[PDB]
Amino acid sequence: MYYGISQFSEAYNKILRNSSSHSSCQLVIFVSCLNIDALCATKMLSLLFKKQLVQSQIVPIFGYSELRRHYSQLDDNINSLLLVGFGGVIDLEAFLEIDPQEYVIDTDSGEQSFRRDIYVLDAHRPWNLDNIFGSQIIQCFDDGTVDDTLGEQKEAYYKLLELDRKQRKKQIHEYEGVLEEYYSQGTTVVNSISAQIYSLLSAIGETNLSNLWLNILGTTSLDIAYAQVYNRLYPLLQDEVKRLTPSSRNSVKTPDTLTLNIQPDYYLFLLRHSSLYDSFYYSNYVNAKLSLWNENGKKRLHKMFARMGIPLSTAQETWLYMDHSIKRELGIIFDKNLDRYGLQDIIRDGFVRTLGYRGSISASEFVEALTALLEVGNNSAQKLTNLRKRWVSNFWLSWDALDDRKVELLNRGIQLAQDLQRAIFNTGVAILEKKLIKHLRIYRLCVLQDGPDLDLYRNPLTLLRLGNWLIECCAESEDKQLLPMVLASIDENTDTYLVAGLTPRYPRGLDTIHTKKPILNNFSMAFQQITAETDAKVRIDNFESSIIEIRREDLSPFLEKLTLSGLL
Template sequence: MLTRLFKTQLIQLQLVPVFGYTELREHYMKMDEDIKNVILVGCGGMVDLESFLSNDDDDDPINRSVYILDTHRPWNLDNIFGSENIICFDDNTIDDELQNEKSAYQKLSQLLEEEDDEEEEDEEEKDEEEEDDEEEETEREEGDDNEEAISSSNDENSNSKTEDLGIEKDEGDQGEDESDPKLRKRSNKNDSGKTKKRKKMKGIIHQLEKTIQKYYTQGTTISNSLSVQIYSLVSLLGETDMDYLWLTIIGATSLDNTYPQVYNKLFPLLEDESKRLVTNTSAEMTKTPDTVKINIEQDYYLYLLRYSTLYNSFFYSNYVNAKLGLWNENGKRKLHKMFARMGISLIEAQKHWLYMNNDIKKELGNIFRNNLDIYGLQDIIRDAFIKIAGYRSSISAFEFVEGINALLEVGDSSGDVSSNANRDKTVDNDYLPIDEVLEKRSKQWISNFWESWDALDARDHMKLQNGINRAKLLQAIVFNTGVTILEKKLIKNLRIYRLCVLQDGPDLESYRNPLTLLRLGNWLLDCCAEGSDDRSLLPLVLAALDTTTDTYLCAGMAPKYPRGLALERTEPTLNNFSVAFQLVATEINAKVKIDNFESSILEIRRDDLSPFLEKLTLSGLL
């Protein structure tokens, strides 16, 4: 959306994909000095960029404007209140929700400056006093030398004169050389006043720091869809059309699985905008093979229905799987009975959607309403955005997102994503140095990014089709791993979170990618939320062994609500692992790498995982 907008405005740009903070800083440091504007999309909002992007040899680190488009929260307060060169695009959360933090931040900055100034003054006073003491000591030594010289020659005369005048020598008279007691008392009084003032200032500083610390430790979340923010910018410039709207819908839909509250809040806004654009363009639109139309139609929580069979779309749906427990034989029997109850034969259900009986397809919604309540699947029907491109088949936004995500995970030219192909690659990697392995992965991820980028182009249907095919294979891999986890009871219900550690299995190498690990985590969380008798909302720690680097990729995921309850909630669930992971790793001095923009994902050395998890359990941070 942004690149298209810049091109229409004849603005030159370079797009650089980055996959972590290390790459972000490296690319920034290599940037040409002539580039004066940098836009960070989907990253940067949660770290102090002015410090992070600084050159150690440069007192003025930011010599260009850096714009942040990032919906990860919490904001780093230094970015929004403490820098003139960092410009943050906000979605009204700053004005609506951060006034207390803004006041605390500004007051704290002021007090810390005053404290620094006082410390500098004290240092200067101390230096002056030391200089005065040195001068007095020098004068005193010179006076003593003169006094000795005089007294040695006139000692007898002075004694006789003193006796003649009847004056007795008093040691107290020597006190006239010392400082005045009144001055000394006044000085002590001033010092006491300074001490009280500093104690009071430190108390205020402590309270302000607690306010800010509470804000940072509340947990992380996503506040909005980034694509919706960009669409607002496009609207201000009068550039809106169906292509912009579809990309906006894709971005918002991608949040539904993990942040359904955000998607549900945005759906009515996107629905209104879709109707507005259709109304404005329908009068002048003549249907052609390239005509693009966006409808709001009845859809279902089924997996890639238009690109699969009805049976498989039920079988691989996270929602249906969690409700019926399809990982065991009893769940499969329920599924078969359900089809019989709906009057759909298994032979018909296993036909590809394109070749399925049209009468069944047209009546599917009514069939579901009349039969699925008994199986607890009453929430299976939903509305969705459907893109219709000319005379070709339609695609829902949810299906489009699945195809794009799969290309991000495994790419288009990476061959088969089955376990055998991955295992062959692993054998090769086992004999490579770790640096070469990591470099190879980084190049693959960049390639995957451009594959998914190309698939966003409405004219390149084959890219998206390949992504959807890979999505089906990935979902099957996740399903098989999930079944193994549940059958072997690898999920441990600890006091404050659930834990699952993967150390072997035919598809273990698939979970070296954070996106695939999160895909599995969401599958497990859905099972915990929908399918088990224990509905306690516990978060999940999921770790998978990477034998090539001798580390675990570890993800901390917030708990999920059952789909029915999730639809009623308005606030997104906070993820507390971001802060907890960092604090625990620091406390036990574990060798970890927290480089992902999702700060609840880390890599940890194999030997450090057990003490890390033990400390996390006892930390009280969750």
């Protein structure tokens, strides 16, 4: 372990001592864009440092190349660096060309001090042992995994470090085997950065309703792909909401009251900001459980609505103007008429925040709006950089959406979320009708070669959204065995693909012994190994490890070698 849960306050105090000078701005926060959890964590840090008047700079970085370029550009005065959402799975001192002898001051006296401190803050579990164990400059905000599940790796790393006959060589190979089996592991996510920073705030005592709301947003960002993590962290948020809500309950509503509530939040898509029919129709879970992509699915949906006794005219009405008779009986109606179709998991408990008279909104809807703003908010090596520039710019739109004074931007985000879900649904029914997903014995490939609005999928977030749609659809099919999926999308302007190796997941709400063990995404190591040999102009720079940009002509040989690769 490097920084446990109980000693986050030590890191915060170290940051304050090193860089809380009003003379200059010696603190720089590197945030990974295209990550809602990192966005909420950086918003928390921004508010916390605004309270203590610690001058700081927030830089959205898209890829590892940008991180390296910025660090090279980074001045030596800046003596505190925060990496939010990345950096925990690579040799940062090696990647950034860091040698501790050039950053050490006042070596003496069993202590050491350095002129610059890098605090990595992410949730991807393959901690690089040369970062968590063998470097003092790099300081990792651990969540308790290393101090409990890395004892063997700690011993193996230290023995090899200190040792630089037959028994000695045999034991070295035995220890080196322990390190090797630690690697060759898929990259998962166990915690949410927002929850970690909220734990730090609880240690410092700066918790309030806005920070709790940011924590809820960051945690709810994990419910789509890491539902086990969200279910693990949910009781803590539930306790915090009860702790922070004022005792003056059942009071009259006033234009100033902000209420965090735990009320039934059905697992539909933008239920409060769109019609009930559109909430069922465009839901990922409902689509998986009913197969609405085919023609018979719409008939099933209409039959369900008739069964509940909700007229289609009322069902398609906007949620605000739905008749108060139906809107107040949603719980009873869903209890009576959902287990018939297997949608019992739709009913759920979530967090809903109302700001005075501005109407309710749930964290699930809020994160969809934020994601939409990230995705569509606003010869070959140059236009791609223009895309990176636009993608960085969208981070600030999603950042400004968090402010309560910019609801006119959150509504635009909601509209963009509805449009993007519509486009995702159209492309999904186009893929599943033409049977574009080629089943294999290693990975179910799927390449998007032509169609409409194909420029949406050059963004990694939109491609992951489509992949999550497909994976949710496949997960509820019993015949289809679990298998990694690959999505690609040709970028005509740059003549390059965007391969996004995904991971399968068990059906939502299905809790078993094998469900408890998380599924690990093995595509990162496979991609890196394939790129190391057989130079193919592959661009592996995303913080999301399992996403690469490959030339149009080099895609097929790359996939051939990947098929020959048994790593994944």
